[PDB]
Amino acid sequence: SYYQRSDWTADEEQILLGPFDYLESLPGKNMRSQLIQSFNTWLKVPTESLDVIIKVISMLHTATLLIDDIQDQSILRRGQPVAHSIFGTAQAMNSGNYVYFLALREVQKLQNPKAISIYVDSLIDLHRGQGMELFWRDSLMCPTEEQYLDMVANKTGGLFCLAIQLMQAEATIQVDFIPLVRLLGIIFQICDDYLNLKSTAYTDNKGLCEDLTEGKFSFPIIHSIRSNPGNRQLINILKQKPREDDIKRYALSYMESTNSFEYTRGVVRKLKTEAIDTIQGLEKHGLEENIGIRKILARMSLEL
Amino acid sequence: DSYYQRSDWTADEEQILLGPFDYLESLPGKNMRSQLIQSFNTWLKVPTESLDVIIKVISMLHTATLLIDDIQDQSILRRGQPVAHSIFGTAQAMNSGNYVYFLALREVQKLQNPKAISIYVDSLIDLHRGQGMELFWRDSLMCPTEEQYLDMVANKTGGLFCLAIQLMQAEATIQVDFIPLVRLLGIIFQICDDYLNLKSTAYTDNKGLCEDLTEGKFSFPIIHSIRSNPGNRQLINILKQKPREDDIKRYALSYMESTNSFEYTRGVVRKLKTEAIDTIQGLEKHGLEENIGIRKILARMSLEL
Amino acid sequence: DSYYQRSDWTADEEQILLGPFDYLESLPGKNMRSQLIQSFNTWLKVPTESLDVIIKVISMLHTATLLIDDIQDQSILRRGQPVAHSIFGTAQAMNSGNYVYFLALREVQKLQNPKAISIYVDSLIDLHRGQGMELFWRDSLMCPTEEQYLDMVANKTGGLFCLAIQLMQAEATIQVDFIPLVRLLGIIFQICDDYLNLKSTAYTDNKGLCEDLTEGKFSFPIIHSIRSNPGNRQLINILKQKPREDDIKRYALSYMESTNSFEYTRGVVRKLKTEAIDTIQGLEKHGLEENIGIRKILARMSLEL
Amino acid sequence: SYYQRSDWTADEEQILLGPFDYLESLPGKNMRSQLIQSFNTWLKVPTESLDVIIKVISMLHTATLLIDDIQDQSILRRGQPVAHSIFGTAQAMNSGNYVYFLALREVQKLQNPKAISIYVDSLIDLHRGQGMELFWRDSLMCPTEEQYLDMVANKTGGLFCLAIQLMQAEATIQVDFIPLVRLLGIIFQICDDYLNLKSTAYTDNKGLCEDLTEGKFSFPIIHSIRSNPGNRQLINILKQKPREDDIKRYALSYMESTNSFEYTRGVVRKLKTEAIDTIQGLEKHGLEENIGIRKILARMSLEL
Amino acid sequence: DSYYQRSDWTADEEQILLGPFDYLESLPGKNMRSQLIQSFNTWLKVPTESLDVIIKVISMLHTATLLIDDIQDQSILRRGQPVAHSIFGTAQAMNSGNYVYFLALREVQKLQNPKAISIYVDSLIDLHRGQGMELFWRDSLMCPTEEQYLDMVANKTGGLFCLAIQLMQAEATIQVDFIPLVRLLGIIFQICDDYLNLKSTAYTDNKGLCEDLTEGKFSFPIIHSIRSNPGNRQLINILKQKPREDDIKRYALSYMESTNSFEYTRGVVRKLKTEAIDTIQGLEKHGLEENIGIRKILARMSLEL
Amino acid sequence: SYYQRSDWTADEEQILLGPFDYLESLPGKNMRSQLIQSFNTWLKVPTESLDVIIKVISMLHTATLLIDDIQDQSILRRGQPVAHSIFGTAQAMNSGNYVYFLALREVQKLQNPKAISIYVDSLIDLHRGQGMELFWRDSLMCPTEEQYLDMVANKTGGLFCLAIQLMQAEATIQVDFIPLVRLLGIIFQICDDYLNLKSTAYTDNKGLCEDLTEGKFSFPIIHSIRSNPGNRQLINILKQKPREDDIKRYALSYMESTNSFEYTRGVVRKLKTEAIDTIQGLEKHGLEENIGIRKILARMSLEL
Ligand SMILES: C=C(C)CCOP(=O)(O)OP(=O)(O)O
Ligand SMILES: C=C(C)CCOP(=O)(O)OP(=O)(O)O
Ligand SMILES: C=C(C)CCOP(=O)(O)OP(=O)(O)O
Ligand SMILES: C=C(C)CCOP(=O)(O)OP(=O)(O)O
Ligand SMILES: C=C(C)CCOP(=O)(O)OP(=O)(O)O
Ligand SMILES: C=C(C)CCOP(=O)(O)OP(=O)(O)O
């Protein structure tokens, strides 16, 4: 026989995962792990299953960062070069998408038919969020705040929800924790939008105001653009995708003149109050008091 | 009362997400994976309702793979028309393709077959393993051996051929193993494609002159030509240059003729076709009915070689 | 004794300043604004000495506007020859054009007409208002409505048509108002131009294939095609891409045929021509002599529609 | 009727003036206003007419900056991004040229036929100066100092002269103030050439030695090039339009080695002496002593 | 025992170093410097063994000079095929060419002629002096006079013509001075080349349409055209733009016809050929045998003028 | 006669040498001059001949820098702009290659037939070294350490050897000093490789880690790449030719994790011991003790 099939080797896997492993070697904050831990106080998934869920979520998170940095044309990630500036965009993109299917193979280890459907629905939502974000970015059409939050719910919220939905599929309690975790994912993204423009640690981690370089209609940027439609400086800056710090500093000063950062702090305050009220409701109906989830809520909105 | 109210996904939003995908589906193709499915169905006799799901799944995945491949290769034309990302941009075209990978998975679940998910995942894993090794060689400028190339092709082009027939086997009541045959057909198909990309007027019209050279790809005849004289480094350096210019590509093409790499490639395809026919005859001698359709697909895919 | 002595402007320096302008004037054009002036002069009978100043002013302004337009649109060809800034650079071509705007103003003063300056200024103001709105839509990727487009065209293309006839009226002894007619003729002229840019071999030779697409312009048929199916976003995304490639432009052209946008455009031009002829007949019925020349200009500018 | 003409709206005007209004929102030094005020001590134009003249000159100045920054491919203006790096070059250019005709409409408010001719002649001179400057820049041909001053007289001098010529057209005194104001405009431009290469505030406002990046044959650059024609480093640096600070610092050091900054200080000294002598002559022949115009002369040459 | 052991240079490494050089030598040329050598050998009768070394030295240097010239000029085609640096990159092509300059020097030493090294060095010095002045004018956008241009050509193109015949004279037993004649032939050859680059279909196929314009070169007819009307600056500004576009080049070509620069160039070539024939006849009248071959080379190099 | 040949003028020579003279006006360290002086203690070449040799070596050194900076696409040289960023690559390249033949004309002044052959052989070796270095760089194929040292012996070693071989051709002593000088040239290049990545003065002189920007397989880079072939981050960084300091700092940190700088220090130590042993051997066999050559050895490896 002319052709003889070879088994896949560890050396080849190491090539395929080159970009993924590079990113995993960079220290992150591990918010999603602490979120899983805080929900497990209530759901009490055993560690055998929980370890699979934690691995799945870490894999999907790192892979999504690989792809996001390419689609956004970012330069820094966790204060280090983005993976594709080392390995090129094609290998980094292929590595991220590969890991999406390695993670599905990992979910299959739960031997839980509902978990498969949960995974598919979440990967569908993730791409629906990325697709609408890109659509607005490329068309230079500023979404409303309500459209933006629906996109965030699909995107950033999709992974938060995936983690807790898999936990629920591995527990017999009949309480719906997803509205709460979706709310926490929305809070987390709005804080991220804010800190991208205001936090010095975020300047060290990704560059100054990198959402402006990337042309993104983020939460405070939307508010600023829509607060004065007759002034088109900020949306035109987005169009220009500026790498220059002078343009970005001018944009940041414009956004303070429209009070878009106080606006964003006030919305986060309102959503945190809803989150606390939801936690208190869950506990009033039979769940033990959960200190860890209050600490996660406080931590993600620590600034602001 | 909640500050945020989740909205349902709408048809208008789906139409945005599928903009690049719908664009590519509106361009007429050769629909050969459908003829392959039909020719194996002569033996497997999958019920119409399951077969329609498999055909849809394979069509979706094929188009989605084309969206992504054209981006990763920086192609210009697809089916003689602009590549989708030259209309929608690379980011939306890439996202649309990967989106469809998961819509197709949702479609696969309609078979309600406990084995179907693992089959799908194993195939998507193979597809990415093949693409990743091909990009690895391209970017490092390291020419694989022919054997390494065929293992990569088996993963890549073969992975979707194999997915179609593996789902059909999972849905059929007979237990014959058709996968070694279909993987061989996928390899033949890809080598023929490598040849036609460089030596076919129809492919020049559909994808540009010798576009594998522009993309820097170590394709089957290119590997042979590079390795037949390692002291001459013109061809591998042309690959490095990723030329869009027809003059460099015509020179490279003339060099590959000088190393007799197209004869070499035709001879390999002939040997593989002979193995394919022998395998088909073996399957028929052991019970299966004579399959004219699968011989036509084999004759069709190697027509110009 | 002064350290600095002011020198007089010289012919050699003027020749430098007008390098781009003289280049464009040496390229044969259709000289249709001169036929328009002549056809309205059948009615207005401006004395030869004043008419020569107006003809010169309008020629100067037209060429200068072309210098600037080709830069702002990033055009490549003009009258089948290189755009002036691809010889002299954008900065000198732009400065030469804006220079001529003020040389033409100096020429206008030779009419010694107290009203002529205001007429000139109002027209240059309209011209910049039209160009500014067109650039605004182009850069923001926001498709105007047809009504917004025509208001912009009325300012832009119409502003110079109107300037010619408004100066002629100011210099004539009759008080008939010809401006609504000439603004209508300017709109017809521009819509015909939008059509011919996409669907005329002579325009392909003079400015390139479908150059409005390369420039990203929301022209009359392009607006119709975009708005006829807002769920398909291929055409507006092609505009965003500013394609120089003929394959994308041919696809866009084929899409616009599929939305029936050229029939739509021909039908609009037919209605506007009917209004123009009715207005002409109204002017003649109320005293003015029958004007064959103005009917020929109307027939000429819409010939291929 | 198929087409109905719409009136121009305030929203559309706000679009057309987007780039102009952006620049006007950036604080300048207001030299031309203080120049007008110092000459009005002698010309005593009433405020109704003077307000029109001041508005016209401000409009033309800001519009000329919009266009100059595009033609020069500048990056900063008054320490902020150039207007075209926000709005793009086409809209910024159209906005500037639009304002040239809005300013002519403003001049018409004087109902002074001579003022129209003065405006046209000055806009003609302005473009003659810009055209010769660009011609030398693009052809890499170093003008003589005398050619450079003729160009400056047309360009920078054209607006100084416009302001005072409009004032003279609104006054009955029969004294010719234009030779003096032209001299002040030449002094102002030579100081500007110098400060572009030597002043730290100018480095903050436009970047380090931005005349080198722009390839301009400015007053000290001409002197340095011509002081040693056998050394072609500086003219070749101009050709390269360097954005790198290392090349610019090397060029600046070369220009000090040719004593081009002392040369420029000495010329400014000689011209200031002529300016003072001209002022004293005007006053000896019947005009009151003008302290303000001496302060303007001192201020524009304060450094140097 | 030493940590480092020096290895001998290998054939495989030489093959790498000469990759760009061997590529260019595999492309058929006109081999006119070989006909020139043969035609002067009718008079000089250099022994075969020395003549073979000179022929090899001149071939090596010519190809090496082409490698470098194509890089310095940013050329695209050479002998109708891709320039070597568009395959191997500029750095390896440049290094390979300069390498061969010193391999040729090693070859020259085989003549064992005490004068040969100085002759070689003086010629390489002249070659670089000519290239350096040509680049100086190109980069500074300063049009030389015709006399300055010819001095540069005498250094550049003439330097290798002169090297061949100077080595032949050094190896021959007669003392006749042929260098003024051969330098004149080198000048004629270069002016003809300048003309054919702009006005010859064979040169369009071998190097592209009017490639001297793309390269920004002040060639013989271009100098004439620029200087015949210094108030028109279109042509020198086109040189500045280094146009790859055929439309700009066709316009420039049409402008040069309008200044009658090709007639001017043909007339100059005619005068120089007349001087060359008179010099040849003078050499023959004073003893040398009638040389048909050198008249054929002269007729060949000016054939199309 | 239609054409009259002109003599070459000093003004034209000044044009041809523009880039060369620019580089010569920048202060270097003069290692090769001190090397020649230290060997002359033994060879005692008279100053008339030695002055020619010193001039030849200086010329070839400066010319090689001109060309290397172009082929490497460097940005800084001796802390100043590379010559081609002023004069353009074509004139700078032509000037360097011109000087190669001016130096050969200078060598002819020795009227020493062996000196001509020595010069040719060294220029041949120089190009053989540059050619193999470029071959590996462009093909992304990491040489072995032994291949790298053979290339260094041809390249950097070729000029060291040329200097001392010309000295030997002008002396009657029958001792072979070339193995020693070749060893010193190898030591010098390995120190240069190291200091390019580790010395702050080298950061000021050429930029941070400029060998990474240039894609060069230098001595410590080779060791790091080959120490872990399963990790391909560093070779992929070389492929990317990064101008970004973040990527370069990441690469530098990777190379410390593979101990490639300690490895390089240890090799230099071993070679210096061989150099000292070779010097001691030459002196044991009849040569006077040479303090200067020990100081040169100490100085070139001063760091490390
Ligand atoms: C936080 C988690 C789950 C792990 C680290 O990722 P990063 O901290 O770097 O990224 P974000 O969570 O801020 O998206
Ligand atoms: C042939 C099939 C399955 C459908 C059309 O796709 P294409 O013809 O364009 O692409 P390939 O099958 O050649 O990969
Ligand atoms: C027709 C006139 C007035 C003169 C020639 O200009 P062009 O023909 O080239 O340009 P348009 O009139 O079509 O705008
Ligand atoms: C000085 C005036 C008239 C107003 C501010 O303009 P700028 O100060 O910023 O610019 P220049 O006068 O220096 O040209
Ligand atoms: C003519 C000779 C000496 C050999 C072929 O080289 P080319 O024909 O390609 O180049 P030129 O001689 O025209 O310079
Ligand atoms: C050292 C010598 C011979 C002279 C100065 O050159 P540089 O010091 O700048 O360059 P390298 O010797 O480090 O190569």
How is this structure best summarized?
Chains B, C, E: Mg(2+) 4 binds at residues 69, 73. The structure is a homohexamer. With 304 residues, the first copy, chain A, is mostly helical.
What key phrases describe this protein's structure?
homohexamer; 304 residues; mainly alpha; 17 helices; 2 strands; 1% strand; globular; binds 3-methylbut-3-enyl trihydrogen diphosphate; Copalyl diphosphate synthase (chains A, D, F)
The largest chain-to-chain contact, stated as pair and per-chain residue counts, equals:
A-B, 51 and 49 residues
Question: What's the arrangement of strands in the largest beta sheet of chain A?
Answer: 1-2
Structural category of chain A: mainly alpha
Oligomer: homohexamer
- How many structural domains can be distinguished in the coordinates of chain A? 1
Distance between the termini of chain A: 67 Å
Rounded to the nearest angstrom, the radius of gyration of chain A is 20 Å
How would you spell out the order of helices and strands of chain A?
HHHHEEHHHHHHHHHHHHH
The distinct ligands, each listed once, are:
3-methylbut-3-enyl trihydrogen diphosphate
Got a strand count of chain A? 2
The helicity of chain A comes to over 70%
Estimate the global geometry of chain A from the Cα principal axes.
Answer: globular
Strand content bin of chain A: under 5%
Biggest beta sheet summary of chain A: 2 strands, antiparallel
| Number of DSSP helical runs of chain A | 17
PDB class: transferase
Keywords: Prenyltransferase, Isoprenoid Synthase, GGPP synthase, Bifunctional Terpene Synthase, Assembly-line synthase, transferase
Assembly: hexameric
Entry title: Crystal structure of Penicillium verruculosum copalyl diphosphate synthase (PvCPS) alpha prenyltransferase domain variant, S723T, bound with non-productive isopentenyl diphosphate
